[PDB]
Amino acid sequence: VVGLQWMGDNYVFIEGDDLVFNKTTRFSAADLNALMFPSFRTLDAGRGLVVLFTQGGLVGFDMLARKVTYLFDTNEETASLDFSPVGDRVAYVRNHNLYIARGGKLGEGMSRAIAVTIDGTETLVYGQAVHQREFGIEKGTFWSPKGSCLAFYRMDQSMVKPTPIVDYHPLEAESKPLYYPMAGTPSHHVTVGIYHLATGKTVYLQTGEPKEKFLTNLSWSPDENILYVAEVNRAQNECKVNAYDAETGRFVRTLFVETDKHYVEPLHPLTFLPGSNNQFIWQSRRDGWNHLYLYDTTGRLIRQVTKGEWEVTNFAGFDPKGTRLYFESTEASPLERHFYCIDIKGGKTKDLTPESGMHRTQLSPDGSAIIDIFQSPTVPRKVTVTNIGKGSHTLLEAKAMPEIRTGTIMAADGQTPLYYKLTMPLHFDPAKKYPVIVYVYGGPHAQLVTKTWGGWDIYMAQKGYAVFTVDSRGSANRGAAFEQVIHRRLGQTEMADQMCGVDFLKSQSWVDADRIGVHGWSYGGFMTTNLMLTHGDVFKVGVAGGPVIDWNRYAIMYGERYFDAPQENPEGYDAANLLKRAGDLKGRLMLIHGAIDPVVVWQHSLLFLDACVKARTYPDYYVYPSHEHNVMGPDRVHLYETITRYFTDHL
Amino acid sequence: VVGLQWMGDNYVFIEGDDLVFNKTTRFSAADLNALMFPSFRTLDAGRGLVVLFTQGGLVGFDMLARKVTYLFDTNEETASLDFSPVGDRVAYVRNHNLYIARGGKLGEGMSRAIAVTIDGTETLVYGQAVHQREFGIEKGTFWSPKGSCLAFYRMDQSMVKPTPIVDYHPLEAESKPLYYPMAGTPSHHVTVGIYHLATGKTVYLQTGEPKEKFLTNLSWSPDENILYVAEVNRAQNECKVNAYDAETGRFVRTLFVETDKHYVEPLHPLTFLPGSNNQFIWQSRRDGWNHLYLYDTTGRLIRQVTKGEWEVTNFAGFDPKGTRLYFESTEASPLERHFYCIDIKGGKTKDLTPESGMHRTQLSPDGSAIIDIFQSPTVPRKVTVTNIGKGSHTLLEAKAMPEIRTGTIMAADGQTPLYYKLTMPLHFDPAKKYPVIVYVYGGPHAQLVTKTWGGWDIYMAQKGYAVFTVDSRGSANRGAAFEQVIHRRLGQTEMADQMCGVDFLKSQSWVDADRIGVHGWSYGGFMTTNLMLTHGDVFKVGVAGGPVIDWNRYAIMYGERYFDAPQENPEGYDAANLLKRAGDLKGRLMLIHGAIDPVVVWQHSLLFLDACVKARTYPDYYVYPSHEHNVMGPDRVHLYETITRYFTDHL
Ligand SMILES: *[B]([O])([O])[C]1[C][C][C]N1C(=O)[C]([N]C(=O)[C]([C])[N])[C]([C])[C][C]
Ligand SMILES: *[B]([O])([O])[C]1[C][C][C]N1C(=O)[C]([N]C(=O)[C]([C])[N])[C]([C])[C][C]
């Protein structure tokens, strides 16, 4: 059901040719083409306003009125586009600087874009994501809700020592500095500008010292008078939610402060109640579980709205009156996602999607209805549309492969339940012994085992290899205690729990205990390498892609949260520094890296090979010179074949 | 016999503790230590003047007088040291600039070095090798024979587009540009300065246009009035030997010009006859074979001194009177090296080292005697000392391993004999079938098969693998016709001849024709890869180290000699461009590269892996991040084990 979404009070989808509306009407590509089924980006679901990407600029389109809105000329920039909530202007970044282009109405001619900044360059970045995209930061432009102002980040990274990123395709290779701030080093300096459209004036927030402070979750007041910022200290154990005057940039007040033994991690903006300039919802994991908190703008906590030993995983919004909250959570089970209603006064949740498994739900603009997309181990796809507190309507339902087994084991503490998935060999025979590969990630913010319906496990299984994954402690959606055990000690608990997975595998009669392998990417590449070095008698063969190898060389804003700074934690960093234990490699391990990886710099795997040379140990290697952190697109076929053949050759 | 050499009329060697002199006297490390067995560099064999490298500077020492000469302070620079023939000054390069330090006599105090240049930097190089060390160029400083002047290269490479060379060892990796001028691109601009010690004045040779001309084989007149230069054009098919006035830098005259259908390649300086400012010996391959030619300084050729279908391989010098020439050549056999005498009037050579095999010979300062070091397949080491035209005296003689077989096959023309060596499996059994690896180089200036006594072949042989090498056409010491067949067509003839080697192997009953592999480094890495892609049905497994893959990315001064320029020869370059045929890889090939390789830039192997990704083919890889073109020192053990295990795993 291509593009299933809300447009006004209609739910909408594509039929290769038509856009179909239901509350039935149909809008074809030729109907549309006459007014200039293609791709679009929805800008305003309530109004069904979208933008169409065409040869020769952007065309805004009102799908409810069936009328062109505006033509935009952004000099071919698309990545950084951020349309005003008014819908008639768009911000974007081009050749280092921030611009605003105004939409032009059909046959009324165009105006030249406004340059918000003029001194952007390699070490001075405007209007883009900062702080290595930590703290929920995905972009660097933030329109005020009435379109009067454009707030934006200014990142001076001139003090950061860069890493070369080399393009090998020109005749002579060309390097460009990547200002990647490594653990324990000087951070970049971010400030927040606000460009006022009426006056063309810019003011900077007076965020003050230390200049390294992290400026996160920018959130405008509904009346546009105040810009709120969640400021996080370098230690990452204090978050202050502060109000700044949008007119002058002056500090107004600190609403509240959160602190934690290990770390605080704000990830979501303040969300104001409907029709209110004075009350908002703030997400916080302060009580050990991510919950919704109701605050007024003086900083006074009215009440914790949600509570329980489960986590809110998506805040979807309010009823029109702002007396109810809608949200996705783990309340039913950490392996599941359901959509709920709760009174703003708190109390009992009501599960609006009760069936056991994974629900992905979209609340209608008017808050009256939901689109639900469901899948489970027995149900490939069930698409429903429901009038909340009324009838439900099914729109679509779907109905030798490797067998997938699931269950629970105890973690190394002997108390915490861990959930696993096991992809069995194709045509598995219980009388036979099989090799098995532990596919591991194990890092924060991910959860690999859910009650659901990129298939590398199935490919391995088709080659006669079982694939086992377990979500060890450190992993997500199980509360802060379950995650924070890793603090200052990366790899230690994670590997202990992965070895409980191995204990379970060895308890299976059909497992060949002498043919156990391991594979993972990124944090999973760190884990793969660490497991081979630490448990060299168990793990015969592994493949580690884009692996972290020396945490001192990972980015400040992620690494120092989980590990603290290298100066504060030499014992922990040293224990996880795989360069120090390269002489423990006694099996077959291939490392793979994208050469232009700006997340885990190529240096990590290169230094490991260098360490292995000195240590006289013998890893294998592959480099994708055109790829960044992950191998994307058709080349992923080459990746899977390289990884698979390594295991079929050696394990 | 450590350090065997001439000092005055004595032959000399070390005995761990003593320096022993014979014409017998002995000089111990304690005798020497009292005057301040250690290492030294001999500066003047006739006078037995040496330099000793010590903590706190250089100490010049007269071994015949047993006296310190001078103390030198070169601010710890050692690589670029070039001592004046007078022995009391030394030139060197430090922080981009050329200096001359004067020696200080014991207890007479020291003087500050003189700065010859002051504006050296990354794009302006002084006193170093230029033209990528082609044309016999090994250094960039050239003292006049009486020490009155210091000539030096100035290389402006500001027009060359650089390649990043990345040091991965700092916390954040650090790149430095390498001004490596690739085939068909703008070359660097070399001029020659002459610093006059008496006046402190510098003059530049008026070498003129084109500024890209190659300035080679700088050779001072004995009277210091003229500096001769062999100038080579960009096409490399014309060499002009020109005289310049040392006082003014003005052009004086062109002595003679050499031209060739394919290429001219001057490799040696003019060597003046003893006591003569008017006659010199010039080496030239103009008649198809490297020979010695007698010229006067007007440019008039007196006579070709040596001639024949063999090559002079080392010119050792003259009798004191300058009526005879001494030299090493292939006259006995291209597989052998003997030392000869010939009258300056020419005619018959006399072989002074008649025994069949490899002789390495040192003519005494007075030209009366020779030290000879001999080895052959039956003789590991025989060291002789002979009074020419008188008695000879033996000083030393040396006396399950893999069997080494040698023989001849016909090249692909069916006419030219090729010589091969075959290292048999350890404990070879004629009833058994064995895998075999062709170890290939095949490029110009090398000859791998000689009648002699780094052992990778023996290691492979010990693992049960035969190793076969054949010197295909293109290879050295067989005359110009045998080499120049490759011109404009790199890889084509070489591979045709290597396939004659395969034909020979397949004719052996003990060869397993389905288990043939190939290995080589550099040009041999190009050949390994090319053979796998071209003859994929034959070569099952290969390992290619520091391989050339795209000749457009090799250095101008070597590549354009053998291949012409890419614009002049698209058909030839395209045929050898292994990036275009990466989809033909159907066996197992590991490429290996030193990351900081300044000879074959790392880009070659990286782009091949990138080509294989697009082509969906599957090479393997290893990178030595701390190594340049070859893996040197203890790490070479790791290299051999990586290469060997690849073959034992897959072939
Ligand atoms: B990996 O697992 O993809 C990589 C190494 C460990 C963390 N990591 C990430 O990509 C994380 N993002 C960041 O580090 C951002 C770029 N700062 C992901 C997994 C989100 C936590
Ligand atoms: B290799 O075979 O080591 C490399 C690639 C082909 C030629 N080559 C060389 O190292 C040659 N020297 C140069 O290219 C110099 C550095 N310009 C050697 C073999 C001498 C001919």
Provide the 3-class DSSP secondary structure of residue A125: strand
Q: What's the order of all strands across the beta sheet hosting B369-375?
A: B358-363, B369-375, B382-387, B392-397
Owner of token pair 């075999």 = B436
Phi, psi of B435 (to 5 degrees): -75, 160
Answer yes or no: A73 catalytic: no
- Tell whether A574 lies on the interface with B, counting CB pairs under 8 A: no
Best mutation target, A613, A618, A622, to test chain B (most B CBs within 10 A):
A613
A496 membership: H or E segment, kind and range: helix A492-506
Provide the 3-class DSSP secondary structure of residue B526: helix
Q: Of B481, B476, B471, B446, nearest to B263 (Cα)?
A: B481
Best mutation target, A160, A163, A165, A172, to test chain B (most B CBs within 10 A):
A172
The first and second tokens of residue A91, run together, are 């911000």
Q: Of B176, B179, B165, B162, nearest to B597 (Cα)?
A: B165
Q: Which atom of ligand 2 has the smallest separation from the CA of B131?
A: 17
Among protein residues, the one whose CA lies closest to atom 18 of ligand 1 = A445
- Tell whether A640 lies on the interface with B, counting CB pairs under 8 A: no
- Tell whether B626 lies on the interface with A, counting CB pairs under 8 A: yes
Residue A296 · residue A306 · CB < 8 Å: no
CA distance A287 to chain B (A): 38
Best mutation target, B607, B613, B621, B632, to test chain A (most A CBs within 10 A):
B613
The first and second tokens of residue B67, run together, are 């006296």
Provide the 3-class DSSP secondary structure of residue A280: strand
Q: Residues of A with CB below 8 A from B552's CB? A: 171
Residue B68 · residue B59 · CB < 8 Å: yes
- The ligand whose atoms approach the alpha carbon of A629 most closely is 1
Answer yes or no: B629 catalytic: yes
d(CA B258, CA B301): 12
Q: Of B161, B154, B259, nearest to B207 (Cα)?
A: B154
- The ligand whose atoms approach the alpha carbon of B558 most closely is 2
B556 CA to centre of ligand 2 in angstroms? 12
d(CA A134, CA A185): 17
Provide the 3-class DSSP secondary structure of residue A605: helix
Residue A118 · residue A97 · CB < 8 Å: yes
The residues facing A470 across adjacent strands are A420
CA distance A529 to chain B (A): 17
Q: Of B342, B345, B297, nearest to B315 (Cα)?
A: B342
d(CA B413, CA B401): 35
Burial (0-12, 13-18, 19+ Cβ within 10 Å), A462: middle
CA distance A71 to chain B (A): 38
Residue A400 · residue A366 · CB < 8 Å: no
Provide the 3-class DSSP secondary structure of residue B173: coil
Answer yes or no: A167 catalytic: no
- Tell whether B167 lies on the interface with A, counting CB pairs under 8 A: no
CA atoms within 13 Å, Cβ hemisphere of B255: 25
Q: Residues of A with CB below 8 A from B555's CB? A: none
Across the interface, whether the CB atoms of A173 and B182 are under 8 A apart is answered: no
Angle at the Cα of B70 from the Cα atoms of B68 and B74, rounded to 5 degrees: 135
B507-532 as b/e, with b when 16 or more CB fall inside 10 Å? ebebbbeebbbbbbbbbbbbbbbbbb
Catalytic one of A597, A604, A605, A627 = A597
The DSSP output letter for B498 is H
Among protein residues, the one whose CA lies closest to atom 10 of ligand 2 = B599
- Tell whether B318 lies on the interface with A, counting CB pairs under 8 A: no
Residue A552 · residue A182 · CB < 8 Å: yes
Residue A351 · residue A332 · CB < 8 Å: yes
- CA A149 from centroid of its chain's CA atoms: 27
Torsion of Cα atoms, A15 then A16 then A19 then A24, to 10°: -30
* Rg of the Cα atoms in chain B: 26
What separation, in Å, do the N-terminal and C-terminal C-alpha atoms of chain A show? 41
- Look up residue A105 and give its amino acid: K
Q: At what angle do helices B492-506 and B523-534 cross, to 10 degrees?
A: 70
Q: Which residues line ligand 2 (CB under 6 A)?
A: B 132-134, 443, 445, 522-523, 548, 555, 557-558, 599-600, 629
d(CA B639, CA B631): 7
B130-168 as b/e, with b when 16 or more CB fall inside 10 Å? bbbebbebebbbbbbeebbbbbbbbbebeebbbbbbbeb
Which segments of A247-311 are extended strands (E)? 251-259, 271-272, 279-284, 291-296, 301-304
Q: Of A229, A255, A221, nearest to A149 (Cα)?
A: A221
Question: CA nearest B162 in A: which residue?
Answer: A172
Across the interface, whether the CB atoms of B163 and A173 are under 8 A apart is answered: yes
Neighbours of A118 (CB within 10 A): 9
Longest CA span, chain B: 79
| C-alpha dist (Å) from residue B400 to A244, A405, B397, B434, B458 | 85, 57, 22, 18, 11
Q: Residues of A with CB below 8 A from B622's CB? A: 609, 620-621
Among protein residues, the one whose CA lies closest to atom 3 of ligand 1 = A522
* Sign of the CA dihedral running B5, B10, B15, B16: negative
* Sign of the CA dihedral running B640, B641, B646, B649: positive
The first and second tokens of residue B107, run together, are 């207890």
Residue A337 · residue A313 · CB < 8 Å: yes
Q: Which residues line ligand 1 (CB under 6 A)?
A: A 132-134, 443, 445, 522-523, 548, 555, 557-558, 599-600, 629
Neighbours of A90 (CB within 10 A): 27
The resolution in Å comes to 2.0
CA distance A161 to chain B (A): 7
The DSSP output letter for B121 is B
- CA B432 from centroid of its chain's CA atoms: 41
Outline where B263-348 has alpha helix (H).
none
Convert B34-94 into a string of H (helix), E (strand) and C (coil): CCCCCCEEEEECCCCEEEEEECCEEEEEECCCCEEEEEECCCCCCCCCEECCCCCEEEEEE
- The ligand whose atoms approach the alpha carbon of A132 most closely is 1
Among protein residues, the one whose CA lies closest to atom 19 of ligand 2 = B445
Across the interface, whether the CB atoms of B610 and A616 are under 8 A apart is answered: no
- Tell whether A601 lies on the interface with B, counting CB pairs under 8 A: yes
- Tell whether B599 lies on the interface with A, counting CB pairs under 8 A: no
- Experimental method used, please? X-ray
Across the interface, whether the CB atoms of B620 and A621 are under 8 A apart is answered: yes
d(CA B71, CA B60): 6
What separation, in Å, do the N-terminal and C-terminal C-alpha atoms of chain B show? 41
Catalytic one of A96, A196, A535, A629 = A629
d(CA B441, CA A614): 28
- Tell whether B632 lies on the interface with A, counting CB pairs under 8 A: no
B596 CA to centre of ligand 1 in angstroms? 29
Q: Among B179, B523, B630, which residue has the most ligand 2 atoms within 8 Å of its CB, making it the best to mutate?
A: B523
Q: Residues of A with CB below 8 A from B168's CB? A: 603, 606-607, 610
d(CA A281, CA A274): 11
Number of residues in chain B: 651
Domain spans, chain A: 1-399, 400-651
A572 membership: H or E segment, kind and range: helix A570-576
d(CA B140, CA B152): 5
Neighbours of A570 (CB within 10 A): 12
Q: Which atom of ligand 1 has the smallest separation from the CA of A599?
A: 16
Residue A600 · residue A551 · CB < 8 Å: no
Which of B164, B613, B645 lies nearest to residue A164, judging by beta carbons? B164
- Tell whether B36 lies on the interface with A, counting CB pairs under 8 A: no
- The ligand whose atoms approach the alpha carbon of B545 most closely is 2
Q: Of A154, A223, A155, A242, nearest to A195 (Cα)?
A: A154
- Tell whether A552 lies on the interface with B, counting CB pairs under 8 A: yes
| Class of CATH domain B400-651 | alpha beta
Among protein residues, the one whose CA lies closest to atom 3 of ligand 2 = B522
Of chain B residues 171-230, which have a CB less than 8 A from chain A? 171-175, 180, 182, 185
Domain A1-399 has CATH 2.140.10.30: yes
Q: Residues of A with CB below 8 A from B166's CB? A: 164, 166, 175
The DSSP output letter for A182 is B
Among protein residues, the one whose CA lies closest to atom 4 of ligand 2 = B522
- Tell whether A34 lies on the interface with B, counting CB pairs under 8 A: no
Across the interface, whether the CB atoms of A185 and B175 are under 8 A apart is answered: no
DSSP string, B325-349: EEEEESSS-TT-BEEEEEETT----
- Look up residue B82 and give its amino acid: D
Burial (0-12, 13-18, 19+ Cβ within 10 Å), B4: middle
DSSP string, B220-252: E-TTSSEEEEEEE-TTS-EEEEEEEETTT--EE
The DSSP output letter for B128 is S
Q: ω before B210 within 30° of 0 (cis)?
A: yes
Q: What's the order of all strands across the beta sheet hosting A392-397?
A: A358-363, A369-375, A382-387, A392-397
Q: Residues of B with CB below 8 A from A621's CB? A: 620-623
The residues facing B6 across adjacent strands are B11
Q: ω before A210 within 30° of 0 (cis)?
A: yes
| C-alpha dist (Å) from residue A398 to A361, A378, A380, B347 | 18, 10, 6, 97
